[PDB]
Design a binder for this molecule. Structure first.
Ligand SMILES: *[C@@H]1O[C@H](CO)[C@@H](O[C@@H]2O[C@H](CO)[C@@H](O[C@@H]3O[C@H](CO[C@H]4O[C@H](CO)[C@@H](O)[C@H](O)[C@@H]4O)[C@@H](O)[C@H](O[C@H]4O[C@H](CO)[C@@H](O)[C@H](O)[C@@H]4O)[C@@H]3O)[C@H](O)[C@H]2NC(C)=O)[C@H](O)[C@H]1NC(C)=O
Ligand SMILES: *[C@@H]1O[C@H](CO)[C@@H](O[C@@H]2O[C@H](CO)[C@@H](O[C@@H]3O[C@H](CO[C@H]4O[C@H](CO)[C@@H](O)[C@H](O)[C@@H]4O)[C@@H](O)[C@H](O[C@H]4O[C@H](CO)[C@@H](O)[C@H](O)[C@@H]4O)[C@@H]3O)[C@H](O)[C@H]2NC(C)=O)[C@H](O)[C@H]1NC(C)=O
Ligand SMILES: *[C@@H]1O[C@H](CO)[C@@H](O[C@@H]2O[C@H](CO)[C@@H](O[C@@H]3O[C@H](CO[C@H]4O[C@H](CO)[C@@H](O)[C@H](O)[C@@H]4O)[C@@H](O)[C@H](O[C@H]4O[C@H](CO)[C@@H](O)[C@H](O)[C@@H]4O)[C@@H]3O)[C@H](O)[C@H]2NC(C)=O)[C@H](O)[C@H]1NC(C)=O
Ligand SMILES: *[C@@H]1O[C@H](CO)[C@@H](O[C@@H]2O[C@H](CO)[C@@H](O[C@@H]3O[C@H](CO[C@H]4O[C@H](CO)[C@@H](O)[C@H](O)[C@@H]4O)[C@@H](O)[C@H](O)[C@@H]3O)[C@H](O)[C@H]2NC(C)=O)[C@H](O)[C@H]1NC(C)=O
Ligand SMILES: *[C@@H]1O[C@H](CO)[C@@H](O[C@@H]2O[C@H](CO)[C@@H](O[C@@H]3O[C@H](CO[C@H]4O[C@H](CO)[C@@H](O)[C@H](O)[C@@H]4O)[C@@H](O)[C@H](O)[C@@H]3O)[C@H](O)[C@H]2NC(C)=O)[C@H](O)[C@H]1NC(C)=O
Ligand SMILES: *[C@@H]1O[C@H](CO)[C@@H](O[C@@H]2O[C@H](CO)[C@@H](O)[C@H](O)[C@H]2NC(C)=O)[C@H](O)[C@H]1NC(C)=O
Ligand SMILES: *[C@@H]1O[C@H](CO)[C@@H](O[C@@H]2O[C@H](CO)[C@@H](O)[C@H](O)[C@H]2NC(C)=O)[C@H](O)[C@H]1NC(C)=O
Ligand SMILES: *[C@@H]1O[C@H](CO)[C@@H](O[C@@H]2O[C@H](CO)[C@@H](O)[C@H](O)[C@H]2NC(C)=O)[C@H](O)[C@H]1NC(C)=O
Ligand SMILES: *[C@@H]1O[C@H](CO)[C@@H](O[C@@H]2O[C@H](CO)[C@@H](O)[C@H](O)[C@H]2NC(C)=O)[C@H](O)[C@H]1NC(C)=O
Lengths: 197, 148, 49, 50, 56, 49
């Protein structure tokens, strides 16, 4: 099942988009007192609320993140969902073997909704990029809320939570006993050999 | 343009209004076990007050502060042929000092083992407690062997 | 971070920093095992809005 | 006894956080961070009406 | 006789604690006398009647 | 016209985000017995990526 949790936020400067920076036009725009106020407030406030409640959902647990490993699941091969090692250091996580597929096998449709680089627009040597041209019109795309690093920390912690069993000193249980515990929640298990595992 | 603004806001408020009714029915009137719906942790009760254009909720929840270690056992095996497990999966049998006690796994609520706390099963696991019917009274203080 | 957007937030003095995820302790399903178990023992009351 | 003493302490901090006499310290507890989040959401609703 | 969960087949030896006593019977219940109740519940012992004989 | 399209998208994404939060708390962190909420059949555990 797939559920969307965020949308790339876009903010627009009302004065630059309508007047192109012409000084005379800016004075005429003041007659439309509530026109720009409504447009800027709606885009700015919606983006801040979106980033506020997304950051509330992203919890982390260092204890559970350590258990996101193939050695913690036994016969259940979770290698396709655990995070990848930090290939270049300076970080604690990375994309799983399924996240990079969904993020790359899907079309690289960078036709405008790119949080492109702003520091090269005003001092660059080459003619302006398609993204810089939008920035000159006051349309600027903010960086995505769901950061790539926070995602791997968040998902890695949740996957590792399934290996926790409430043991003293945080010892990890065999994963065959985690499934048995969740089966007992359905109906009290009377089988002793546990061959059904 | 004004109709577009009002219809957009009505759709947003209607979605939030339906969530408020669910929380009033499941968190304020009743007590919920749906994790995270009435705040994190174990829900006890909720309060509600008026607010500008809406409601404000005050979820009262319990958070743990200390933990107790217990030497827990998976079950019992009497004479090597009669196996027993706890009647409720949320209970745990543990050893304290020389005797035994039963406690819930959610809250530490000690309980004296009664024969009705167990369920008989066909086989015995190797991790079960070995005991005979002669000494079963050490685990269940009310057990009396009426045969013997 | 007094104000936040995406991966970065700002302080009361205007310093820009990255927003780290909120640290919490996840719950767990107590296992039916012959092992050494930790059970919640003392409790506190918290109010959330 | 402890549950009642803890509840009264939380309600007092909730009322003080709503009044906003110590706004710059309420972030010290994520329980009080819910109050800050609630205040921000109420302000947006009030300002955007007109 | 055995007891099982209705969701998963989990065979269980019937214990006296698995039953709840009610005021009246039904024509569809297992029709049995107390001396034979041990055939349904292996751990059951009629300590009432057994002590009467052992008083001699 | 642009603001109308964006606000409608934020309304749709907010509803889907709140459903995702419920599935993280009830299907990933916990085990659910609400039929059909975490797939059909008897739920055991869920994974998220
Ligand atoms: C509760 O009580 C029960 C019943 O008493 C205990 O269960 C038995 O526990 C014993 C050990 O305590 C187990 O015996 C060990 O089994 C091993 C394999 O035996 C199988 O295979 C051989 C093949 O030759 C067969 O002969 C045998 O019938 C079995 O099929 C052996 O490896 C062990 O040998 C011991 O001695 C040698 C030499 O000294 C050592 O190298 C070994 O390490 C070992 O010590 C031994 O015989 C037995 O299998 C358990 N089950 C049964 C059904 O008998 C529980 O352990 C006890 N639990 C608690 C918590 O109290
Ligand atoms: C539901 O939401 C509640 C809160 O509403 C969460 O509960 C909090 O969880 C956190 C994370 O575990 C707890 O924080 C821990 O507290 C301990 C005590 O704090 C000491 O240190 C702080 C800061 O220095 C002082 O203010 C305080 O006086 C204490 O001296 C620490 O032991 C924990 O670890 C810290 O220290 C070690 C050692 O340096 C470091 O390795 C750690 O990284 C960390 O810094 C940690 O800080 C907090 O106490 C919990 N309660 C409250 C009321 O906030 C639940 O987690 C959440 N539950 C669920 C199930 O979702
Ligand atoms: C466990 O043990 C009990 C007690 O013996 C059995 O319960 C009785 O079952 C018998 C049949 O075996 C039933 O008797 C039948 O009742 C009819 C009369 O009406 C009944 O109902 C009214 C109230 O509505 C009462 O006032 C009245 O007294 C009766 O009880 C008749 O239609 C039947 O006649 C049939 O059998 C006779 C032999 O008796 C034949 O000659 C006839 O041709 C005809 O076939 C019959 O007598 C009786 O009603 C049951 N009692 C109760 C209290 O329900 C259980 O059946 C038994 N269970 C098992 C599983 O073995
Ligand atoms: C759990 O699932 C994992 C993912 O499916 C399993 O990993 C796979 O295991 C098989 C069998 O060992 C590997 O297939 C062999 O691979 C080698 C070449 O491997 C190298 O090149 C491939 C190029 O495709 C590259 O993907 C690998 O990473 C290696 O660099 C060949 O000699 C064989 O023909 C054969 O195809 C898979 O490649 C491997 N996949 C991954 C992503 O590692 C894992 O084995 C399962 N775990 C358990 C315990 O069963
Ligand atoms: C019912 O009895 C079962 C045995 O018939 C119990 O299963 C045993 O549970 C213990 C305690 O959790 C496990 O011991 C741990 O095992 C690992 C090594 O496990 C791996 O290797 C063994 C063979 O060496 C293999 O059988 C396992 O599947 C794993 O591949 C160690 O890290 C620990 O030190 C510790 O000894 C046993 O491994 C496990 N036995 C088996 C055959 O799986 C079971 O717990 C009982 N059930 C209940 C509900 O009490
Ligand atoms: C959450 O806890 C983790 C540790 O469990 C913190 O991670 C590191 O912790 C040390 C010790 O405090 C810090 O000095 C490091 O800088 C942290 N590194 C990283 C990459 O975060 C984590 O920062 C904690 N976060 C909060 C908000 O408490
Ligand atoms: C799963 O756990 C193993 C064991 O800790 C990790 O393997 C170690 O990885 C580090 C680098 O991160 C190496 O320096 C160690 O030598 C490795 N251990 C062994 C025994 O060789 C493994 O990296 C963990 N998996 C992930 C995805 O982090
Ligand atoms: C008490 O004692 C005996 C063993 O001492 C148990 O075994 C036999 O059980 C059958 C019933 O299936 C009785 O008919 C036999 O008479 C019993 N043998 C003896 C020597 O008594 C018996 O199950 C136990 N319970 C009772 C009620 O006798
Ligand atoms: C549970 O925790 C409470 C809260 O700390 C404990 O009550 C405190 O106990 C200490 C030590 O006896 C006293 O100095 C404090 O005055 C008590 N009150 C508070 C509000 O901290 C209580 O003792 C603990 N209970 C158990 C069974 O460990």
């Amino acid at each position: 099942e797939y559920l969307q949790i965020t949308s790339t936020p876009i903010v627009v400067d009302c004065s630059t988009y309508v007047c192109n920076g012409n000084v005379r036009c800016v004075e005429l725009l003041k007659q439309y007192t509530s026109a720009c106020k409504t447009i800027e407030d709606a885009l700015r406030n919606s983006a801040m609320l979106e980033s506020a409640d997304v950051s509330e959902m992203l919890t982390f647990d260092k204890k559970a993140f350590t258990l996101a490993n193939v050695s913690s699941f036994g016969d259940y091969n979770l290698s396709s969902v655990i995070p990848s090692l930090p290939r270049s250091g300076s970080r604690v996580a990375g994309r799983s073997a399924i996240e990079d597929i969904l993020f790359s096998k899907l079309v690289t449709s960078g036709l405008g909704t790119v949080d492109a680089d702003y520091k090269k627009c005003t001092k660059g040597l080459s003619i302006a990029d398609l993204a810089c041209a939008q920035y000159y019109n006051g349309i600027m795309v903010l960086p995505g809320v769901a950061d790539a690093e926070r995602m791997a920390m968040y998902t890695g912690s949740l996957i590792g939570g399934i290996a926790l069993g409430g043991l003293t000193s945080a010892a990890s249980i065999p994963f065959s006993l985690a499934i048995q515990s969740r089966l007992n929640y359905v109906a009290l298990q009377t089988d002793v050999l546990q061959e059904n595992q | 343009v004004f109709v577009s603004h009002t219809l957009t806001k009505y759709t947003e408020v209607r979605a939030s209004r339906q969530l408020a009714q669910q929380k009033v029915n499941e968190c304020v009137k009743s007590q919920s076990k749906r994790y995270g719906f009435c705040g994190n942790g174990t829900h006890i009760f909720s309060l509600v007050n008026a607010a500008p254009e809406g409601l404000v909720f005050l979820h009262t929840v319990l958070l743990p502060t200390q933990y107790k270690d217990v030497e827990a056992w998976s079950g019992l095996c009497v004479d090597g042929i009669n196996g027993y497990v706890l009647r409720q999966p949320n209970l745990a049998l543990y050893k304290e000092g020389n005797y035994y006690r039963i406690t819930s796994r959610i809250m530490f609520e000690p309980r004296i083992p009664t024969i009705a706390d167990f369920v008989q099963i066909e086989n015995c696991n190797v991790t079960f407690v070995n005991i005979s019917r002669s000494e079963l009274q050490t685990i269940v203080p009310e057990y009396i062997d009426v045969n013997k | 971070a007094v104000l936040t957007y995406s991966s970065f937030g700002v302080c009361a003095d205007g310093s820009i920093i990255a927003v780290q995820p909120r640290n919490v302790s996840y719950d767990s399903v107590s296992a039916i095992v012959t092992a050494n178990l930790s059970i919640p023992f003392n409790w506190t009351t918290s109010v959330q809005v | 006894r402890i549950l009642a003493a803890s509840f009264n302490k939380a309600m007092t901090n909730i009322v003080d956080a709503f009044t906003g006499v110590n706004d710059a310290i309420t972030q010290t507890s994520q329980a009080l961070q819910t109050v800050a989040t609630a205040l921000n959401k109420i302000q947006d609703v009030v300002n955007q009406q007109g | 006789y055995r007891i099982t969960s209705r969701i998963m087949f989990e065979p269980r030896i019937p214990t006296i604690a698995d039953f709840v006593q009610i005021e009246n019977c039904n024509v569809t219940f297992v029709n049995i006398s107390r001396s034979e109740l041990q055939t349904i519940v292996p751990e059951y012992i009629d300590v009432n009647k057994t002590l009467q004989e052992l008083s001699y």
